[PDB]
């Protein structure tokens, strides 16, 4: 007997509008040893269908399936079975962490009441040593004294890191894992996969893992289900998704994930469109909207996964026009690379031994001060009108703190910054506003760097209000400023609060391109977008320096990213650039052993 | 934690004692307790004028009187009334009667209102919480006294139906009560019910849509369904750790919940009948009295204050960040 | 193109909450008819019948009369004048205290904000209505109500503005106002369009409730013989006096307490529905 | 309902055999609030409902019967004749079995020290009535102690009323010194010899309770306790409808319909010798010192409608008081306020010929706005009065400010001092009118609390207490209060209807009206 076999499931949410039918007879299942990769664009309801497996939908949703866990049927079961499962034979990763811990209580006393709920006697002086244990093998860096933590002063990457530790305390005979690697930088997610395939093989528990990387599912997981629209669209091994697509939707999702081996401006193939809103739902296959091979039979019913080959299902009608095959024909575009490098000699930032420290701060009234971080510590920077250049590291390092120094235009605690040709030094902030206009930046975090109480409208039209811009000419850029990045009118009249994640970081880039500057400093603006989504973006802004010559300081967790966009890198370690170079002679020749493991911790794109 | 609270009522101490001295200086200009002495028509000589001045300490600066009213008001004596009765022979068994009131009322009303509003938290939209939403709010939206005079007279054709006189309205005890300690504490348990209702009926309302808010913040953070997803059952998870973060903002406005319940009392006091504080409170602005009014806001802002210093300890215990550790 | 504004989205938001514009409707009705109905009536104010005491409902007397002889309806409108127009003043002025105060504790910060609010505090410690009760004794029996209105206002405005500071200091330490200077927008421009329009609905919402406080300490006061005097009539009055005989004569008690109520049931409402619509989901 | 407000011969008290109800029982009734002075004989001790309890504990020379007869108290004295004719000497025979609380026996000397403690003639005693002990020569022993003779200086009529009706008898050792007078009972009274006594002041609770008697010598009460607690008017007839009290007075319409409304109430009516009023304060200093602003603002104040408001539902067809010495049902009532016949058009023309012109809301005078203090009981039915009082006055121009104050030191603090303009109380008499004539009208009557008074008054008053004939006394009686009222004294507002609601089951105690009660036979219901 496996450890899943989901049979039919289908979860309906009944908000005041129709009701929205997140999955719609999904069927499937999970072995002992196995690791299922649950693959597809956003709200095509996969975490809708884990959520519902392990039961903590909320009472306004109508599940109707037959998930058995050992035989166990567990949608009937009535939270006294069912809190004795979970835990104990089912850990839950959840998605987004940043509200998934006890604010009143402390991270060790937590990792521990997960211990000591299903060992009952085990004393709790055991279960916390047990706890503590737990946050090193996760890699939290200071585990006995971070273990006396409030979950409000975590970094984020860490608290995303403390519920895994709570996920796997009490050694599950099935966890589950929804996008466990979003928070997390190359060398933490590493390791992070490293304790996976540990209680993987030790063990010898499923994982129902459910992905944002596909990098991450060629070298870890074992079979794969790529959902659309609350149907599992397609069903291989690993080995078999990647270099037999077999299926347009998983054509265009495979044909728009970047590669460390690409060159410099290669341009990606997303699918083009918006996924459709599982309320109204038209007949006909669910990808007929989007799919460049659609034909009026493709219309008469939603098509039903058959088999085209052994162990490879695939719901498509028309799916032998596909193998072979590459994404650049089946969605009749060009990948290649026209403006290699914008050859020119203007420098636009140069930056010279930069520093910058944060007076510490750890007590409250008459607090005995002592150390201070060195955020910076000699950092020297340039940039050459029409070219990006990539800065790479680990949480901590101080990217962001170098942004920053650049954007307030003023002098330094030490250093010499030149933007656009000038020292600024003689420029104080009136002088400085009229420089504000051809050099803006991409906040990290969407969800604070905007207002939450203005439409997108105003959000967005904002930097043109201000600067010397109208009002008939405002609405008008703001029009094709949105449907640029993807959204729709009518989202201008909506408010940040009712916008996801990954909707909500395309409003600020999209803000942020609204006056057309010369120089764009984007922090992680592809942090929470899928791979589908992120390609159209990456295609914008190689195409946008192409035409108009922009220049890029680019920041980013993962690097298959920067080589597609980056000229030059730098590789930057605990405040200082350990090295800088060409893009082909850092991610091509590591000369620093950094740097080397640094490209040795980034997964590669296809399966051995 | 033992530093907590040691700065946390050594301020306590300052705001009394500086509340005390602003609350004199302001019923002292704003009373005349020689008016209607001064306003006699066969005007009275001006020995007794001197003399009753002098009585009362008027012949004396502001500040060089109230040096004096506090430096025996610590000592156990706090003067004369407008007549010349002194106060400390009544103040001391009317803080009881009003004492025994506003902790009955307080300790069922905040408990009450809380568990209202967790409950129909809980039940957002369901024919449960929607009653208790429109009760309390035609509860907080009516006056106390309205409240008081509508419980008197519904209360009456109870007693009438059932005719063992199960509660009364009139004083706080009744003569003739000479049995054993059970028949005098009957007697009270039944003449306190009905003030002690009118006070947590208000208390409750104010302090259950306090609560609903509270706890429906917590409810959309999803640390509940993270607790429960270890194996705790979903009604462990909801009170070791949603109702314990819930409860956080609400020890932040027990205390003005206190002060609200203390201006009640005044009502409730004088329409049952009850000697204790409120009913002197109205008669010692009635007549003009510094003396009864300076030893009333003194109590009134003492409970206030040790109601902020219980909800601080109670706010440490249930929150372990907000100690120093 | 045809983007749509957001005061203009906002009011659109009130509009679909049947139940604050239904509660606000009944107010305004209220306070206009308070003025435009007594000279319609058949009896003035102010006036005794003294072979109609104490009748009930009818034809010359609708609403009834008095233990001595007054229409319970002239008298009641009166009453409700009086009641209203303290509360709606009241209101204003505190809500323009406590923003004043407030603000500038929340931006200057430091020692300032410290001292500004262990003030606050000291003002806390005995409870308002036995602090205004205190000086009732002067401005007790004058004509004019504009003292009366200024002690009520004088003690009202502290737990507001310790809202309206809280939030304008944990306000100017945000992100999204960093991004704003990032921008080029002005120094000025930046409170107009992001500080300006998150306190100036607080404090709308704010002057709701006040209202509601405002006229429960003015029936109170009034009730215990204080506040405002015999010739000229209050709500609380009129409860007061007709306590002794709801029993009897049900009209002459039952009435002033329902309209005022109602009104108060009005207020809560409308404070609620402008919260909603304000900060619509939360 | 429906009844008249005068003083009829008959009582309502629902009369049983005292053999044939219970032996027991409380009795709950009310108090206004707890007395400041136990002494009845005291300026602040002299009360209405403060003689009322103490009735039942103190002597009394006189039964007073339902029509204002008199025979002698057998149980106290045993012989009280009219000896000589030209000098009255009465001769007070006490009895041998009438002893006091503290034991020590009632003779001569405890009669002569109360005739000279109220004599007058000693103004240390701050007293608030001198019947009849100013016109007596001497009290002298009789052939025993127990006999005391009372020798008249000066024609007396009215010797009936010394121990009787309101006053009675107080012991010597109360009565010896000023001390004792003045300052002897202010926290509980002293000996006492009657039926029952007062056995626990408790002030913490405000309950007085009263017991029987060890040493009674009479028939034993059929009741155990009579306990009085204060209780405030706006909370007195629901403490009757929830059973905690027994018996109260009915003043305004509601006190009425909830009292036969109820069940196991019953309500009692027999109107006595008891009127409000409006008493004005002449004495120099009060914006009222002039005879004529008094005489002015009497004519703007209407009585009749005062009367028809005040008294609705409780009698049919109320009227109005027009007399200060007799009431509606004693002999010898007339109507003697002509002079002071509501019209307010005469009150302008001669308060704009006396000053005070209307410029404004209210008239003013050199400044000084035209504007007179109230004072009166906060209860429900005595507010009524100054509400229409003021709504009236308002009419011409004059500003009545009302002062509510409470019940203890009504009296004490404010009336017997002088602090007020108008002052609103009520008067309780017997079946002796004219002994009010030196106690309030005299000019230096000890209880003319606004000092108003003229020397043609006082010759009056002598001329009128000279007279031994009934008849020719009560037109000179009549005769006084016309000058009484053509000048600005007071102002009689309304009778008393005497309507009482006590419990059904609740018997020889209702409404008396002219008669007493007999505290040995006030029983209870034999279920
Ligand atoms: N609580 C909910 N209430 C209403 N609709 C919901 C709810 N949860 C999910 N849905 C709907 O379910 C569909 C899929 O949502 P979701 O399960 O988040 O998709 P997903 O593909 O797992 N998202 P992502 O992880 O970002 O790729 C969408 O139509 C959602 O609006
Ligand atoms: N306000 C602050 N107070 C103290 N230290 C700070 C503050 N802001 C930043 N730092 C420190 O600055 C250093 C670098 O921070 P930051 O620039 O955010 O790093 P980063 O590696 O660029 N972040 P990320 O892009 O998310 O990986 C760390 O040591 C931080 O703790
Ligand atoms: S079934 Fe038709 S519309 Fe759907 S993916 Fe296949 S070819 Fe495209
Ligand atoms: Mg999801
Ligand atoms: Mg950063």
Redesign the interface.
Known sequence: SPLLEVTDLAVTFRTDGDPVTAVRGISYRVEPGEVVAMVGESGSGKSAAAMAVVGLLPEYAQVRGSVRLQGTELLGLADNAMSRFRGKAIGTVFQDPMSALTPVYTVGDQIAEAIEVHQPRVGKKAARRRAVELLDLVGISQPQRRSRAFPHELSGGERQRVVIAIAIANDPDLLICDDPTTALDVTVQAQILDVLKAARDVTGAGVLIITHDLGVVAEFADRALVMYAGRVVESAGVNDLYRDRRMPYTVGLLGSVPRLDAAQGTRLVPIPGAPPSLAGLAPGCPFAPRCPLVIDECLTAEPELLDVATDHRAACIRTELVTGRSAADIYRVKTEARPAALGDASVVVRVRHLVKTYRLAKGVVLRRAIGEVRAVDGISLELRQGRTLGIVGESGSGKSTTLHEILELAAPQSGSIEVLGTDVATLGTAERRSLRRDIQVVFQDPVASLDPRLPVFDLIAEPLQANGFGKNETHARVAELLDIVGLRHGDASRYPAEFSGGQKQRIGIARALALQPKILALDDPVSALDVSIQAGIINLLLDLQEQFGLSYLFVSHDLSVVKHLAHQVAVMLAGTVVEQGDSEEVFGNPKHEYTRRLLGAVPQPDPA | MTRYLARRLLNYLVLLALASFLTYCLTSLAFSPLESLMQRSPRPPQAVIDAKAHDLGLDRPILARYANWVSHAVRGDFGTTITGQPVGTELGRRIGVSLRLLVVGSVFGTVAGVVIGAWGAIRQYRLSDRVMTTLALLVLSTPTFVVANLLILGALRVNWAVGIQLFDYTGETSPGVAGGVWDRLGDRLQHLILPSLTLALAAAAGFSRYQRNAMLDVLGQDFIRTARAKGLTRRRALLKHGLRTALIPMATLFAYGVAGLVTGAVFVEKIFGWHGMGEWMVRGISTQDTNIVAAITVFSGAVVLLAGLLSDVIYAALDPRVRVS | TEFASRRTLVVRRFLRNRAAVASLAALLLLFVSAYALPPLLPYSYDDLDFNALLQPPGTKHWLGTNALGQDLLAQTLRGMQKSMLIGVCVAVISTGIAATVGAISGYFGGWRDRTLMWVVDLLLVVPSFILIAIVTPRTKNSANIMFLVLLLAGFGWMISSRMVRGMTMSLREREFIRAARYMGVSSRRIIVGHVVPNVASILIIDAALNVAAAILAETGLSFLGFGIQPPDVSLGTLIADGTASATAFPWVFLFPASILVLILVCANLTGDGLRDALDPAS | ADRRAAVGTTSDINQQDPATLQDGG?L?LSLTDFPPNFNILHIDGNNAEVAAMMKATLPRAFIIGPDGSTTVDTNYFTSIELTRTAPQVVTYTINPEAVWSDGTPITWRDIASQIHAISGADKAFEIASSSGAERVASVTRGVDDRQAVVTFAKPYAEWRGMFAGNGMLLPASMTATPEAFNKGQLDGPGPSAGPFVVSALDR????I?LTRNPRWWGARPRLDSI?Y?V??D??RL??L????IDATGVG???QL??AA?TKGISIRRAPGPSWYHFTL?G????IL?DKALRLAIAKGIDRY?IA??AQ?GLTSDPVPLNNHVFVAGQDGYQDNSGVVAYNPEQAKRELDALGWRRSGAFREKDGRQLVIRDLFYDA?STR?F???A??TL?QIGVKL??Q?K?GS?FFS??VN?????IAQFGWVGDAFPLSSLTQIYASDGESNF??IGSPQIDAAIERTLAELDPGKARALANQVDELIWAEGFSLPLTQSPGTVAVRSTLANFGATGLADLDYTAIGFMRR
């Not at chain 4, 001092?417 to 303009?421: E, L, P, R």
């Open positions: 409380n709950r913490t609770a405000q309950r309770v306990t607690l209780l405030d706006a909370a629901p403490a409808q929830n059973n905690t305004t319409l509601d319909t909830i409304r304060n004495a120099p200093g009060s010192a409608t028809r408001v609705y429900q009524q100054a509400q229409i003021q709504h308002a400010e009302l509510a409470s030191g603090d404010y001092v002088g602090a007020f303009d606004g000092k």
